[PDB]
Design a protein around this ligand. Structure first.
Ligand SMILES: C/C(=C\c1csc(C)n1)[C@@H]1C[C@@H]2O[C@]2(C)CCC[C@H](C)[C@H](O)[C@@H](C)C(=O)C(C)(C)[C@@H](O)CC(=O)O1
Ligand SMILES: Nc1nc2c(ncn2[C@@H]2O[C@H](COP(=O)(O)OP(=O)(O)OP(=O)(O)O)[C@@H](O)[C@H]2O)c(=O)[nH]1
Ligand SMILES: Nc1ncnc2c1ncn2[C@@H]1O[C@H](COP(=O)(O)OP(=O)(O)NP(=O)(O)O)[C@@H](O)[C@H]1O
Ligand SMILES: Nc1nc2c(ncn2[C@@H]2O[C@H](COP(=O)(O)OP(=O)(O)O)[C@@H](O)[C@H]2O)c(=O)[nH]1
Ligand SMILES: [Mg+2]
Lengths: 429, 344, 429
């Protein structure tokens, strides 16, 4: 059971050094790549991400593709440079320009032939693929313009396996570049169709965690990307160890997705507290779940209280039994009858992994599916609306060769993705 | 008028000698005089008699081409000459006759005409026939391609060319869902209709089931552009593939694509009319490429006909009656026929 | 020898099956090798040396829980060619379960049965227990009976498949994978013993006073009623209740074959100490609904036919003097057309307790089985759910997208409601 990992883009690069650092520490690998086992769980399921080599040397399934040749040297010539086969590392010369219409016009047309060729032997050298991760961004060009074209090949290539993309979202307020309403919705056009699902993450929401819970007002991006690697590990936590139930990446997506259009999700994590709030916190299974339904613990700034939960999958790392979970959720589904969908009854999935984390007693990885996500999209389209009617910031896309009316196709795709959620945010049928 | 005009007809196939003489199949369909509600029963003088389904034109294993064609297609052939878009498509279980319904025979006796050739070669000539004697200028174009696993292959050309990016909308109308990146061809007469459709219908992917060696898997779609004179009414002749069961295919992973993804869009064809029994706050037309194209067809500005070809042999009771609820539920939806003289 | 065999499909087949064979070996006093009442090893195949092979086969599509058995304290017990693993899980998809990946794996399983079937002296019938909620045991077990009852014909078929209920749930396609299974169980199985995960849990909270029970504490309750039926014959007792006899004393009609399970006494450590154990007060426990295995209301409905399997030191006249204290005295009337309602046998030897559960040693034990009319509120819980899960056709594209036509969804609710039309008709005075 292997999956294929892609870090397409600059944000793909700096999440991956945050990703694989907490994965290699989780199975007991060092910072170099040699093995140091704790018990048999770390001996048998290193067959999830890692291909073998001579001795106890392990190589992760990864391709890390960028167009900007600078920041790849921060992980190649930088630390963990002995933990990637440099044939897998592949990157051109010219920068994108924070342009969707350039990473999908010309640069993918000059790398994604040779990028996909490296993906060939990584896929063939396992027995059974499971998923195909392409954790990227939507803001800049490389993570988006290649992030769609490298996506759209694989559905034409491997029409069976699954897609788990962790594309980060632009912010309604704290946005970072100026091409964000164009560089999102073009990528949102390709990502609704070909991707199986995605997990949105917004930085403006992520800043609210450190400003309310951990009480740090001066973090770093390297500190911030360190936090998302919880739920990166949190998804395949149920599989990489001896579990008790419902252990698969597929067992999530077969019943987290009611219709094959919506596919989008909200992410929460628990517990987390500063060193001042450390010991005074207790670690209880009812005490965790009350954190997981707060709007101060989500990774997208849309209010979940404002919407309704279609589906909820709870994935727990540690020592936790069955009705410990549910009996607190019983009181939750009484206090929140305006928050649960009625026409889909019994909307709670649960998943228990029987291995604790490091330096923790229990943990709770949360997957949510609100109807609040259309509001960010309506926020995104409203940002799109004033940007397009003037047709400013335009000829750096058509000048590369994308059609003018092709945007209106994407907005019509974008608007329709918004337009399915208003059935269900007010749903008595 | 502006009524609830949605045309639905049912014509079952005929049993063979080995089937019912072994199986003693259902007694659910009549000899097919006119459309009337029959029954749902098996072991009829016993405790399985449930209900009937109200019909428009039920026909048993008795109906022929010109019995159907003069009453179903021909009152809408005049609507095409009247300047209106029309839509005709068939549906049913696999191996029942819905490929026979659109394109039936390849006899093609080119002295005069063919016999039993299906609705499209009857609607081919009988639009070229009446157009020859109505004292106006005419120009005829067509485009014939297929739909297969969320992909489009041009059945007009055998070359390996496809769409550049995506299916396009327009800012002119809402009912347009235009498909560029694909060729339409010019047609002079009735003698050029079958001339391109012959090799054109051969370009599709006729797979082989355990049941039939002819029950294909693609979605044949036959579009017509009529530039008579200044005006143009597009006409949709659409084939649909079958609702394939699990065990009656022998399908491996190469066959499961044209099993699963085909049934994926046929299920999608369910909810796009299951949401029109009450027409709530969203109409999910954009779920697959089969229903984006039929957006102006299904409940839109276009007159729409529908064929439900089922099997009367007891190969099932699962979707023996389940497929007839599609015409039964979504009968009562309305449209709006609009005129087309394109002002230059 | 009155021989029996086992199969196990899904993790419910594994985890209940892990607890079944543990409790068996302590009854027959064997460890991994054996022998640290004379023989009677109908569960076991005898080798020429002493390593008794349990007549069983585990079937799972995902090699996760099978590694636990092949590495834990029971890898030195089984026949490692018999423990067949799959490649990729059904993953809560009955179409993947019953048809697609199961077809590519049944033909390394069905022939594996036949070698174990042709080694039988004379085989009576056997047991196929799994879950309805999950993927593989719902789907592959559905094909596993119809590809067996086609072959072996007049031989008996039982199943102890575990059943979902609205309080505690794990997956959210549990309405779909139950009612898509019950077509297979209607015409293939002679009988089934459905059991809840909730009433199984609640007795571990109330009548065991264990605060947070785990699944092995759930399963050791479950496997004990399994021991109290088959191997109850395999101790020499004063009476005999044969596997044929359940197929006479509990089934008036070929469709009414859904008994319930009730076990007694289930008393924790500090409470049997300070308690006696009569014959009569323990049979009084049996007709209390607090020892019930499926969340139903038996005092509302009537009983078509009952069965009481006593274990331990039992005199057979407190059978008769106390059964009329239940039958002739109490409020809960029987069916007017069933004239007696009771069948009862006495097995002399005591039940065996595990040394690591809250349950304690007791000199007598009753495994109540009864075909009631109050189980009609079990199917109404699912068919009301299966209604609203279907009325918008949500979560259907993961089934029809695999190959199942929707025509079974018509016949599921048509047959299941008509199956409830016999409980309202036979139970109608
Ligand atoms: C103390 C503690 C949890 C806890 C609950 S009860 C108990 C006893 N311990 C957390 C770890 C908790 O696992 C997360 C989710 C660890 C989450 C990972 C992030 C990076 C840290 O939580 C974040 C605050 C940090 O960057 C620093 C401050 C460096 C970390 O040390 C903080 C930090 O990680 O400490
Ligand atoms: N009785 C019992 N039921 C359990 C136990 N653990 C889980 N279950 C039930 O088993 C269901 C899951 O069934 P599975 O065996 O995993 O189904 P599957 O087809 O094997 O699915 P996967 O193997 O996980 O792909 C859960 O929904 C629970 O209802 C247990 O210890 N005892
Ligand atoms: N009503 C009918 N009358 C006479 N022949 C029929 C009829 N229906 C089907 N056939 C015969 O059935 C064969 C064609 O198979 P067909 O039944 O059309 O498949 P299908 O139902 O259309 N499936 P598919 O092609 O996958 O969409 C030909 O031999 C036809 O003559
Ligand atoms: N360093 C860092 N930046 C992030 C992260 N998530 C999102 N971003 C920002 O999101 C935007 C996306 O830009 P990006 O695709 O990386 O730039 P590109 O090189 O043009 O593709 C930039 O402003 C990034 O800084 C993260 O985890 N770390
Ligand atoms: Mg057909």
């Amino acid at each position: 059971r292997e999956i294929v990992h892609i870090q397409a883009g600059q944000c793909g690069n700096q999440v991956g050094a945050a990703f694989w650092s907490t994965i290699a520490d989780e199975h007991g690998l060092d910072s170099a790549g040699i093995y140091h086992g704790t018990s048999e769980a770390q001996h048998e399921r290193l067959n999830v991400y890692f291909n073998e080599a001579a001795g106890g040397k392990y190589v992760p399934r990864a391709v890390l593709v960028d167009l900007e040749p600078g920041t790849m040297d921060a992980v190649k010539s930088g630390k963990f440079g002995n933990l990637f086969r440099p044939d897998n590392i592949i990157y051109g010369q010219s920068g994108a320009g924070n342009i969707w219409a350039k990473g999908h016009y010309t640069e993918g047309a000059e790398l994604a032939d040779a990028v996909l060729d490296v993906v060939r032997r990584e896929a063939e050298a396992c027995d059974a693929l499971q998923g195909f991760q392409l954790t990227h961004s939507l803001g800049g060009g490389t993570g988006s313009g290649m992030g769609t074209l490298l996506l759209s090949k694989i559905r034409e290539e491997y029409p069976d396996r699954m897609m788990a993309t962790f594309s980060v979202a632009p912010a309604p307020k704290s946005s970072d570049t100026v091409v964000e309403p164009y560089n999102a919705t073009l990528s949102m056009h390709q990502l609704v169709e070909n991707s199986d699902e995605t997990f949105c993450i917004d930085n403006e929401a992520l800043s609210s965690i450190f400003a309310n819970t951990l009480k740090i007002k001066s973090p770093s991006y390297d500190d911030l990307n360190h936090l998302v690697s919880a739920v990166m590990a949190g998804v395949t936590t149920s599989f990489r160890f001896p579990g008790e139930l419902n252990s698969d990446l597929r067992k999530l997506a077969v019943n987290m997705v009611p219709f094959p259009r919506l596919h989008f999700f909200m992410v929460g994590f628990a517990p987390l507290a500063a060193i001042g709030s450390s010991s005074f916190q207790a670690v209880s299974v009812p005490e965790l779940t009350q954190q997981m339904f707060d709007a101060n613990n989500m990774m997208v700034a849309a209010d979940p209280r404002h919407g309704r939960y279609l589906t909820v999958a709870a994935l727990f790392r540690g020592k936790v039994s069955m009705k410990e979970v549910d009996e607190q959720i019983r009181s939750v589904q009484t206090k929140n009858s305006a928050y649960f969908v009625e026409w889909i009854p019994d909307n709670v999935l649960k998943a228990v992994c029987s291995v604790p984390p490091k330096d923790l007693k229990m943990s709770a990885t949360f997957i949510g599916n609100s109807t609040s996500i259309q509001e960010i999209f309506r926020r995104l389209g409203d940002q799109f609306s004033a940007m397009f009617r003037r047709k400013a910031f335009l000829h750096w896309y058509t000048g590369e060769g994308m059609d003018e009316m092709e945007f209106t196709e994407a907005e019509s795709n974008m608007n329709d993705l918004v337009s399915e959620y208003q059935q269900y945010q007010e749903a008595g049928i | 008028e502006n009524e609830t005009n949605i045309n639905v007809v049912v014509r079952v196939r005929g049993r063979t000698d080995q089937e019912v003489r072994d199986n003693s199949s259902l007694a659910v369909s009549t000899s097919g005089a006119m459309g009337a509600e029959l029954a749902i029963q098996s072991d009829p003088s016993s405790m399985l008699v449930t209900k009937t389904y109200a019909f428009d034109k039920v026909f048993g294993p008795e109906a022929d081409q010109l019995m159907l064609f003069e009453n179903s297609v021909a009152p809408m052939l005049e609507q095409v000459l009247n300047g209106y878009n029309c839509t005709i498509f068939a549906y049913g279980q696999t191996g029942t006759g819905k490929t026979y319904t659109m394109s039936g025979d390849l006899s093609d006796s080119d002295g005069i005409l063919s016999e039993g050739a299906g609705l499209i070669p009857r609607a081919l000539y009988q639009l070229f026939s009446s157009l020859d004697n109505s004292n106006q200028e005419y120009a005829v174009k067509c485009s014939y391609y297929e739909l297969y696993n969320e992909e489009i292959r041009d059945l007009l050309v055998s070359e390996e060319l496809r769409k550049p990016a995506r299916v396009f909308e327009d800012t002119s109308r809402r009912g347009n869902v235009v498909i560029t990146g694909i060729e339409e061809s010019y047609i002079k007469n009735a003698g050029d209709g079958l001339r391109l459709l012959r090799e054109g219908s051969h370009r599709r992917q006729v797979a082989a089931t355990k049941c039939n060696d002819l029950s294909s898997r693609s979605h044949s779609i036959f579009t017509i552009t009529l530039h008579r004179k200044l005006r143009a009414s597009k006409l949709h002749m659409v084939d649909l593939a079958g609702s394939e069961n699990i065990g009656r295919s022998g399908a491996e992973n190469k066959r499961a694509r044209e099993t699963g993804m085909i049934n994926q869009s046929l299920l999608t064809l369910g909810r796009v009319i299951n949401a029109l029994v009450e027409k709530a706050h969203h109409i999910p037309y954009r779920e697959s490429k089969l229903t984006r194209l039929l957006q102006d067809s299904l409940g839109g500005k276009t007159k729409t006909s529908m064929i439900v070809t089922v099997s009367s042999t007891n190969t099932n009771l699962e979707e023996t009656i389940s497929t007839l609820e599609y015409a039964a539920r979504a009968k009562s939806i309305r449209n709006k026929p609009q005129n087309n003289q394109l002002v230059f | 020898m009155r021989e029996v065999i086992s199969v196990h499909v899904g993790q419910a087949g594994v985890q209940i099956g892990n607890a079944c064979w543990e409790l068996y070996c302590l009854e027959h006093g064997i460890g991994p090798d054996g022998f640290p009442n004379d023989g009677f090893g109908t569960f076991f195949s005898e080798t020429g040396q002493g390593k008794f092979v349990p007549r069983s086969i585990y079937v799972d599509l995902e090699p996760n829980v099978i590694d636990q058995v092949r590495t834990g304290p029971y890898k030195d017990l089984f026949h490692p060619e018999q423990m067949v693993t799959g490649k990729e899980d059904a993953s809560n998809n009955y179409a993947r379960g019953h048809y697609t990946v199961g077809k590519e794996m049944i033909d390394s399983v069905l022939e594996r049965i036949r070698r174990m079937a042709d080694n039988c002296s004379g085989l009576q019938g056997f047991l196929v227990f799994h879950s309805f909620g999950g993927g593989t045991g719902s789907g592959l077990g559905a094909l596993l009976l119809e590809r067996l009852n086609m072959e072996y014909g007049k031989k008996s078929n039982l199943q102890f498949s575990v059943y979902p209920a609205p309080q505690v749930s794990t997956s959210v396609v549990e309405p779909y994978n139950s009612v898509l299974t019950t077509h297979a169980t209607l015409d293939n199985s002679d009988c089934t013993f459905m059991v809840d995960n909730e009433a199984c849990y609640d007795i571990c909270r109330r009548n065991l006073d264990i605060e947070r029970p785990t699944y092995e504490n759930l399963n050791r309750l479950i496997a004990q009623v399994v021991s109290s039926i088959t191997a109850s014959l395999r101790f020499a007792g004063s009476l005999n209740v044969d596997l044929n006899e359940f197929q006479t004393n509990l089934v008036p009609y070929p469709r009414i074959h859904f008994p319930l399970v009730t076990y007694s006494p289930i008393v924790s450590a500090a409470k049997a100490f300070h308690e006696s154990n009569s014959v009569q007060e323990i049979t009084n426990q049996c007709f209390e609904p607090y020892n019930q295995m499926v969340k139903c209301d038996p005092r509302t409905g009537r009983y078509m036919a009952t069965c009481l399997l006593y274990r331990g030191d039992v005199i057979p006249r407190d059978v008769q003097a106390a059964v009329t204290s239940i039958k002739s005295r109490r409020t809960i009337q029987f069916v007017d057309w069933c004239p007696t309602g009771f069948k009862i046998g006495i097995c002399y030897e005591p039940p065996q307790h595990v040394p690591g559960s809250g349950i304690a040693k007791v000199n007598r034990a009753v495994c109540m089985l009864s075909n009631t009319t109050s189980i009609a509120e079990a199917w109404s819980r699912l068919d009301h759910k299966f209604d609203l899960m279907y009325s918008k056709r949500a979560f259907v594209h993961w089934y029809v997208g695999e190959g199942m036509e929707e025509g079974e969804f018509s016949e599921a609710r048509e047959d299941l409601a008509a199956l409830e039309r016999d409980y309202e008709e036979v139970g109608q005075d």
